[PDB]
RNA sequence: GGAUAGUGGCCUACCAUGGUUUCAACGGGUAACGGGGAAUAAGGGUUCGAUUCCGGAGAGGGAGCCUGAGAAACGGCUACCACAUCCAAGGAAGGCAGCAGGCGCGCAAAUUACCCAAUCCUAAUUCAGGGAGGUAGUGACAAUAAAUAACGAUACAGGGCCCAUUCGGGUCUUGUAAUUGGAAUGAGUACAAUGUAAAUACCUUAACGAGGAACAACUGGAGGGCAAGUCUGGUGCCAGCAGCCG
Ligand SMILES: *CC[C@@H](C(N)=O)[N+](C)(C)C
Ligand SMILES: [Mg+2]
Ligand SMILES: [Mg+2]
Ligand SMILES: [Mg+2]
Ligand SMILES: [Mg+2]
Ligand SMILES: [Mg+2]
Ligand SMILES: [Mg+2]
Ligand SMILES: [Mg+2]
Ligand SMILES: [Mg+2]
Ligand SMILES: [Mg+2]
Ligand SMILES: [Mg+2]
Ligand SMILES: [Mg+2]
Ligand SMILES: [Mg+2]
Ligand SMILES: [Mg+2]
Ligand SMILES: [Mg+2]
Ligand SMILES: [Mg+2]
Ligand SMILES: [Mg+2]
Ligand SMILES: [Mg+2]
């Protein structure tokens with residue numbers, strides 16, 4: 001066999017045009033070249049997003065497990081988009097409260113669902129300028145109301 | 146978001162103004178007279194928020210009650226097949242609710258000691274007083290659920306999903 | 311006991327600056343620090359310079375006391391030492407006086423307030439006195 | 445804008461985190477030669493690996509031609525002075541097999557312990573940090589100083605401080621005052 | 627409850643006044659000795675956190 | 682020919698019909714300033730380069746120009762738009778993508794500090810100036826170096842054992858005790874002198890400065906992936922953890 005690809009000492013172009021135009025089936029490269037991050041992906045292709053807790057939701061999870069997950073619909077500040085953020089740890093949406101500024105994070109999965117929370121791609125971090133883990137563990141205290 | 150942050154930026158301007166949140170989920174602005182509040186809400190929409198303020202006067206409230214104990218007689222069924230539940234409603238005396246408001250009686254109090262106070266001081270059956278779980282809605286507030294009856298095997302699981310419901 | 315064992319490395323004689331410029335390796339056997347006024351005494355007697363003409367700086371001891379590596383100059387004369395050396399070194403020794411002056415920002419404010427006007431300030435003061443009636 | 449003073453994240457982690465036998469083997473090293481961190485080990489391993497990396501990139505070329513011969517020799521010269529490499533082995537291909545254990549036994553940490561002075565190893569690290577030990581006539585409070593083999597003999601207790609015998613140990617100034625009171 | 631029920635519903639046991647485990651090198655000095663120097667007893671295989679001998 | 686300092690379709694007249702293109706012209710995109718470089722790191726590579734150097738641009742936009750060797754300057758001007766100042770309403774003044782500061786934006790970033798002493802630069806110039814530049818402050822951006830006890834003794838246990846009629850001295854070496862004891866140490870302060878433009882801080886020390894209550898290590902984790910709880914109380918498909926498995 002010749003093994004598909006050309007092998008000439010002067011091929012090059014038919015390699016370099018081929019590898020431009022196969023790469024395009026590499027999903028890493030496609031998002032980078034087409035700015036899905038910027039044009040979509042609620043956060044503007046950004047680590048985080050401050051966004052106002054529009055309501056404390058309970059989201060009934062996917063199968064095997066069964067639990068209502070205690071989330072928060074957010075309104076991302078910059079974009080004006082609305083997303084749904086998870087609130088980690090026992091209760092702690094109690095600590096989130098209502099109509100707070102809430103800083104969000106990606107859940108981990110480069111978009112996508114983290115585990116069983118269907119349609120939630122974000123974790124709360126800072127509620128009105130603290131940190132949920134600092135509240136939950138109570139090493140730090142909330143700045144009053 | 147531009148409102149909320151401006152709203153906070155107003156509350157610090159004038160010594161009087163309090164920018165609290167209603168219990169039915171509505172922003173509120175306090176104002177010593179009513180002139181002052183038209184000045185604040187002129188200043189807030191410009192300057193501080195810099196955004197047009199859609200105004201209303203309040204919400205507010207309100208709590209219902211139950212008034213008269215019916216002791217009768219509605220019965221359940223959720224979906225089919227299912228079980229059943231039952232119904233009644235009180236209300237318990239306002240002396241009890243006052244303590245649940247004040248935080249003398251608590252959700253995180255001793256089951257036996259709280260129940261003995263309920264039966265003696267506030268008019269209750271001591272067994273029924275132990276058999277209450279919740280002080281809805283949810284942790285605090287003067288609504289209750291009580292378990293009377295005898296028999297029926299697996300009440301303990303649904304007892305919690307009754308409380309939760 | 312200690313004896314402040316001074317040494318004087320790298321003596322580069324300099325007619326252009328009218329000085330012997332050099333490093334001062336120094337010691338403290340059980341003493342801690344050498345100090346500068348004590349050094350210029352020890353440089354006066356050694357070089358026949360007198361405290362006035364000696365000018366030493368840098369030092370910063372090694373570590374574990376031990377040693378200190380200055381940068382000693384010895385001028386040809388006191389008048390020679392005055393007209394070459396930067397003012398701050400003459401202040402250190404007590405030869406020259408500390409130059410009492412206004413703050414930096416005040417000098418710049420005074421520069422610009424002066425830039426704002428034009429010509430002599432006697433004209434604007436007489437006009438300002440006339441505006442008291444107005 | 446003088447210039448960016450360059451630096452290195454010199455000392456670099458391994459490419460897994462939990463090779464059980466490495467986790468022990470690193471403990472063994474930090475216990476034998478008394479090292480507060482894994483860092484102290486990786487420090488040596490990298491510092492060493494840099495040398496190895498040279499040796500490989502010299503041994504790729506023919507020793508007889510220039511760099512191979514010169515940089516290799518200078519690389520060896522450097523090691524024999526630092527005293528890791530033996531005087532039996534000065535053959536570049538031996539540098540390749542140097543190991544972390546040989547580097548650590550050359551530190552001022554250890555060359556305290558190997559010349560007596562301390563007893564029980566760690567004590568040296570404590571003595572070193574506690575401003576005794578002078579390799580030249582100059583105190584060293586880095587444990588991981590790397591001793592120059594030439595200078596090994598000159599390791600003694602400091603001119604200043606105790607053990608050399610200038611001033612005894614800072615509870616004497618307590619009890620000399622207390623005994624004078626009685 | 628249906629919001630952080632467990633966090634409340636546990637009896638809080640209080641941090642016991644137990645001595646300072648030493649920091650930096652002296653911590654290593656423990657772990658070196660609690661593996662290499664002391665050498666724990668082994669019926670078949672080595673074990674780094676034992677159990678009180680029971681089911 | 683015209684212009685320009687000058688070459689030129691740079692501009693103008695008259696003439697010819699060329700010019701580029703699948704060896705991607707042209708067009709579009711760029712969350713593109715180029716390069717030096719950066720990270721990664723067998724080899725080949727990928728991605729990044731706003732950012733300490735070198736080019737290039739820009740000084741709210743887009744124009745136009747004065748002076749000048751050098752400007753299509755903007756810490757020059759003219760205008761129009763966009764934004765806004767100061768008013769006695771006739772009219773004036775503007776351009777932080779210098780430094781500092783503030784708003785705004787935002788996940789996101791410092792003090793309206795002290796200095797020309799350095800580094801250099803400029804002029805009529807040894808003599809003046811310089812938010813160019815340095816000096817601190819703030820600073821877990823990075824990076825480098827490393828304290829969080831050490832040596833005893835007595836008191837209770839592990840290990841070698843002169844010998845193992847049963848012991849045991851324990852002659853030798855190690856670990857545990859709110860025993861206790863002598864010997865240091867900068868973390869700090871502070872005359873001093875260093876340091877320094879002046880100071881700080883650093884290096885150096887007069888004088889004080891350790892005894893568990895102090896002069897206190899957190900972070901994460903503890904079924905697997907993957908290092909390590911089948912401990913004690915709760916919890917009881919919930920609440921929760923869980924990158925994935927679960
Ligand atoms: C799951 C089937 C169903 C039944 N047995 O009828 N329900 C008990 C009602 C849920
Ligand atoms: Mg199902
Ligand atoms: Mg010392
Ligand atoms: Mg021509
Ligand atoms: Mg661009
Ligand atoms: Mg580029
Ligand atoms: Mg660049
Ligand atoms: Mg940009
Ligand atoms: Mg440039
Ligand atoms: Mg601007
Ligand atoms: Mg212009
Ligand atoms: Mg300019
Ligand atoms: Mg400008
Ligand atoms: Mg600025
Ligand atoms: Mg930052
Ligand atoms: Mg600057
Ligand atoms: Mg700081
Ligand atoms: Mg120190």
Ligand SMILES: [Mg+2]
Nearest residue numbers: 899900901902
């Ligand atoms: Mg922990």
Ligand SMILES: [Mg+2]
Nearest residue numbers: 902903910922
């Ligand atoms: Mg656990």
Ligand SMILES: [Mg+2]
Nearest residue numbers: 905907908909
């Ligand atoms: Mg494991």
Ligand SMILES: [Mg+2]
Nearest residue numbers: 901902922923
């Ligand atoms: Mg956890």
